C-alpha cells in the first residue's frame, strides 16, 4: 500500500492510497515537557505539562525538526507502518519555497529510507479530487486561491491569505464575549466547536443582521458543565470576516482575492470563473457557496458564467485527491524512486514533482 | 465523409453561418433528403441530355445546345463519376433562363412497374 | 459529494452476486480512465445527424419523436451530450397502423405493394426468431448430453 | 384479446362519430339508414324522438343531453372532432362543452 | 424435440424433459388448489403458492400472479377515481345494494 | 420544484433509451446529478465503457 | 505516389467540366458549393428531394438579407 | 465437497434472509410458518421474545443485537442488502450498520 499524508498547518491528515478517507486525523503539534516528545493529541492533552511547537503553522515547514517528529510519528503511531516499506504521497502549500521541496524528499529518502516519494500541491489534489484538472481552487486553519489550468498550478497568479480558521475562531471568543459571557483562556477550544457546529454565512450580511436585531428566530442555543447559552447574530457575524476581513483590522476578502482569476492569461479565465471550488474545514460554513457565487457575479463581467462548486467532502478533498492520484496507473511511472534519488539527489524533485 | 455530415456544410453554403447558428434548417433539410433518400426513376443520361438540348434550344440559344453536347461526352471521356444521371438531373433543375404542359412529353419511368 | 457520486455510481455497475474488494479496485478504473481525457461544436446538431441515421433505414416516426423531446426539453444541455456519446453500446401490434380500411376520411391512393411487402416481412421474422430458439435450444443441452464424461457437470469438477 | 377488440370498435365507430358531429355542431341529421339515436318526423316534442334500440350504451348516461343539444339548433336555425376510447371520457366530455353552448345562444335568442 | 426423432434415445429424453417435468409439476397443483375459486377469491389463492422459496417456483407463480392480478387492480383503479363499479359478475370486494 | 426536476428526468429517460443506451434509471439518475455538478461529458463516456468493460472480464 | 496523382488530375478536370454545364444552364451554383451536390449525389441520393432543399435555403435567405 | 455444501447453503438461506432484512430495517416480521428467530405475542418485554431453537448458530453471536434492533423500531412506528458468505463478515458487519442507527431514532425520539 502507498501512504497518503498531507501536512496541515492545523491538522494532519495520513492514509492509505486506494481508501477513500484518511485512516487518522490529528494536531499538527509536537510538546515537550516544561518519553521526552509529544506529538498530536497527547500534545495537545497534556498541553498543561508541555511547551508547544507548531513546524508548520501557516502551511509551510518552519521546524524541520520537529517536523521529522511529526512524520514519525504519522507513520509509527497513527498508521502503524515503517516507511522504509511503503512509498509515500506527501502534500504541499501553494507557494512552497524550492528549498524546502528538497529538504522534504532528503528526508523521506535518508531519515526515513522511503522506497518511493511524491509531493503533490494540496491544492491541485482538492481539484483533482472533483474531477477536474482545470479551475481555481483552499481555507484551512492558518492560512489561498490557487488557479490550475491543465494540472499544472499556475505560481504567478496564487495569493495567500493570512486569515482562516484560527483567526475566525479567535474572532468569535471576542464578539461572544462583548455579548456578556467570557471566552478568553485555551475555552478557545469549546468555542471552536461553536463555530464549526452553528455558524453559517449570511447571504446578505445586513439584512441577516436586522433579522437577529428584531427577532430571536436565527439564535441557537449551545450546552457547556450544563450551562445553556445562546449565540446569535454572532452565528453569521464569525465566517464574515472571510469576506470582510476588516472586521479583523486585516486590510481583500475571499470573494475579491478569488483577483487570481484577473493575474491568469484572459483566454483561461472564463474557465476558471466555470471552475471555481472550495476546499479545507474553513469553506465548510453552511451558505458559503451560495454567497461566494453572489459576490463573484458581482466582480465578474455581466456576460460571465460563474459557478462555484462545493464537494460534501471538501474538508478531506485534498486527502482524498492524493488518495486518487497515488492509486492512477499513469502515476506509478511518477514516483520518485530510491534509484532515483541515488542516481540525482534531493533536486530531482524540480523535475519529478513539476 | 458521411451524407448526414455533408447535408451541413450545404446549409453553410447557401446560408452564410456557422453549423452552431443555423440548426432550424439543418432540421427541415433532414426531414427531406431523409425518407426521399432512394431514387425513385430509372435512371439514364440518354433522356435527361435530351431534355437540356430542347430546353436550350426553346431559349434561341442554339449554339450551346451544340456546345453542351460536347461536354456531355468528355465526362464519359474521363471516367471518375458514377452516377452521371443524377447530377445532371439536378443541374437541370436548377436552371434558370436569362430571357408549362408536360405530360405530353418525354417523362422518366417510374420504377413502380418493378418489385422493388 | 463528487467524491461520493462516483462511489454509487460504482456499485450499480457491479453485478450482484468478493463485493467489498471489487469496489475497491474497480474505484481504480474509474480513475485511472477518467483522467486520460483530462490529460489531452453544438449540442442539438448532433442528434440530427443520428436523427438522418434513423430516417434512412425505415422507422421514421421514431426519428420523428426523439426530435419531439429535443424540443421540450428545451423549455442540462451537457447531458445529452453524453448520450449520444453512448449510442450504440446499448444491448441488442398496433393494428391502426396503415391499414387503408378504417379512418373517418381517408385518401386515395391505389395499391400501394409496398406496405404489405413489409408486413410480410414482419412475419417472416416471427418464423425465423422461434426457429433459431430451437436451434439454440436443443444445442445448449446436446453439447452437455454428448461429450466426455463429466465435463459439463460442475459436481464433477470438484 | 383487449388490445384487438379494442381496434375493431376504434374502426367501427368512426362512421357512427361522424354523424354525430352535425347533429350537435349543427342541426342537420343525414342518417341514411335508420341506425341513428335520434329520428325526425314531419307540436315539437313529435318533431325529433329518441329510439330506444339504436344506444350505444356507453353513451347511455347522456341519451338525453344529445337530443337536447341538436333540438335548441333546429328553433334557430328556421328562424335565421369525437374520438372513441375505453377508460378515458374525452368524449362525454367533449359533448357537454357544446350542449352547454347550444342552450346559451337559444336562451339569449328569446330575451 | 420431434425434428430430431429422424438422434435421441430414452436415456437422452430424461436430461432434455427434466425441467419441464416441474413446470407441469407446479401448474398441475396450481390448478387443484384453486378449484371452486371465482373472482378475487382465486387471485388470493394463487398468492397462497408464492410463500414457497424454491428460487424456481416462486419466480414462476409470482409472474400468474401479476396476469391474475391486473383484472383486480381494473376495478381498483376504477372504484377509486370514477367511483363507477360495474360487474355483473360478483368479483370485487365492494357490494352494491340497489 | 421537486415536481419539475422530476418531469425534466422523466423526459431524459426516453431520449436514452431510443438512442440505444445502456444507462438505465439509476445510473441516469447518477450520472445526470453528477454532470449536474460540471464535470466534462466528453470524459464520463470513457469511464462506463471501461468500467463495463472490466465487468465483463469477471463474466 | 504516381496513381494517386493521377487520380487527382482526373477529378479535377471533371469539376471544371461540370463547372461549364453549369454556367451554360445557368444556375447559381460556383465551384464551392457545386463539389457538395456532387459528392452527395455520389451516394446515391435523389436529385428530386435534394433540390427542393436547394430551391428553399436559396429562397429563405432572402427573408433574413 | 466444500465448495458444494457452500453452495447449498448459500441458497437454502435466500429465504431466511429475506425475512431479515424486514425485521430490521422495518419493524414487520412476516414469517408465515413459525420459523424466524423472533416472534411476537400481545408489558413489553413480552411483545418480542427470542426463540432459542431456531437460531442459525452463526447469528448466534449477535442474537441480541437483532432482537434489540426491530423492538426500538415498533415503539416509533406506532407512534409516528445481505448475503451469506464462508469466513466473511460482510453481513455481520451490515446488522451493526443498521443497530446504530435504529437507537439514534429512538432515543433522540424521547430527548
Known sequence: AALVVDNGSGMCKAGFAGDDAPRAVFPSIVGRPRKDSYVGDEAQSKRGILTLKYPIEHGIVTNWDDMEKIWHHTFYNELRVAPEEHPVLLTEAPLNPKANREKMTQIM?????????????????????????????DSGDGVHTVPIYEGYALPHAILRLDLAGRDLTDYLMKILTERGYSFTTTEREIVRDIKEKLCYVALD???????????????????????????????????????????????????????????????????????????????????????????????????????????????????????????????????????????????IVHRKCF | KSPNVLLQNLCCRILGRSEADVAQQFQYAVRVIGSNFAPTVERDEFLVAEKIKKELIRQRREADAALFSELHRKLHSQGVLKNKWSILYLLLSLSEDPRSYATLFAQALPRDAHST | SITQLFDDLCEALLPAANRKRAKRSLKKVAYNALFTNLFQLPARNKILMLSFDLRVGGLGPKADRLEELVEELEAVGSVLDLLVQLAGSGPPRDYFLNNKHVGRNVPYSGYDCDDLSVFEMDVQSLISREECLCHSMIQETLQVMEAAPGTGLPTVGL | AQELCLYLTKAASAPYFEVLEKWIYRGIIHDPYSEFMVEEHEYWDQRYTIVQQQIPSFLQKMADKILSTGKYLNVVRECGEIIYTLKERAYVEQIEKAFNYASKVLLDFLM | LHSQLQSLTLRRLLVWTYDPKIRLKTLAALVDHCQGRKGGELASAVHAYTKTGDPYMRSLVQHILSLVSHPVLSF????????????????????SDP | NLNAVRETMDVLLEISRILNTGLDMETLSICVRLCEQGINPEALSSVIKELRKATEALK
Open chain 5, 76 to 95: 381498483l383503479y376504477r372504484w377509486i377515481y370514477d367511483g363507477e363499479l360495474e360487474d355483473t359478475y360478483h368479483e370485487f370486494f365492494v357490494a
Open chain 1, 109 to 137: 529518502f535518508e531519515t526515513f529510507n522511503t522506497p518511493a516519494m511524491y509531493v503533490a500541491i494540496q491544492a491541485v489534489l482538492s481539484l483533482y479530487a472533483s474531477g477536474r484538472t482545470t479551475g481555481i481552487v
Open chain 1, 205 to 347: 450580511f445586513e439584512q441577516e443582521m436586522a433579522t437577529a436585531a428584531s427577532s430571536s428566530s436565527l439564535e441557537k442555543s449551545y450546552e457547556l458543565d450544563g450551562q445553556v447559552i445562546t449565540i446569535g447574530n454572532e452565528r453569521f457575524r464569525c465566517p464574515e470576516a472571510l469576506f470582510q476581513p476588516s472586521f479583523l483590522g486585516m486590510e481583500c476578502g475571499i470573494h475579491e482575492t478569488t483577483n487570481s482569476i484577473m493575474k491568469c492569461d484572459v483566454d483561461i479565465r472564463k474557465d476558471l470563473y466555470a471552475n471555481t471550488v472550495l476546499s479545507g474545514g474553513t469553506t465548510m460554513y453552511p451558505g458559503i457557496a451560495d454567497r461566494m457565487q453572489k459576490e463573484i457575479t458581482a466582480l465578474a463581467p455581466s456576460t460571465m458564467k460563474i459557478k462555484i462548486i462545493a464537494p460534501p467532502e471538501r474538508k478531506y478533498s485534498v486527502w482524498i485527491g492524493g488518495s486518487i492520484l497515488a492509486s492512477l496507473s499513469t502515476f506509478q511511472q511518477m514516483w520518485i524512486s530510491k534509484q532515483e534519488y541515488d542516481e540525482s539527489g534531493p533536486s
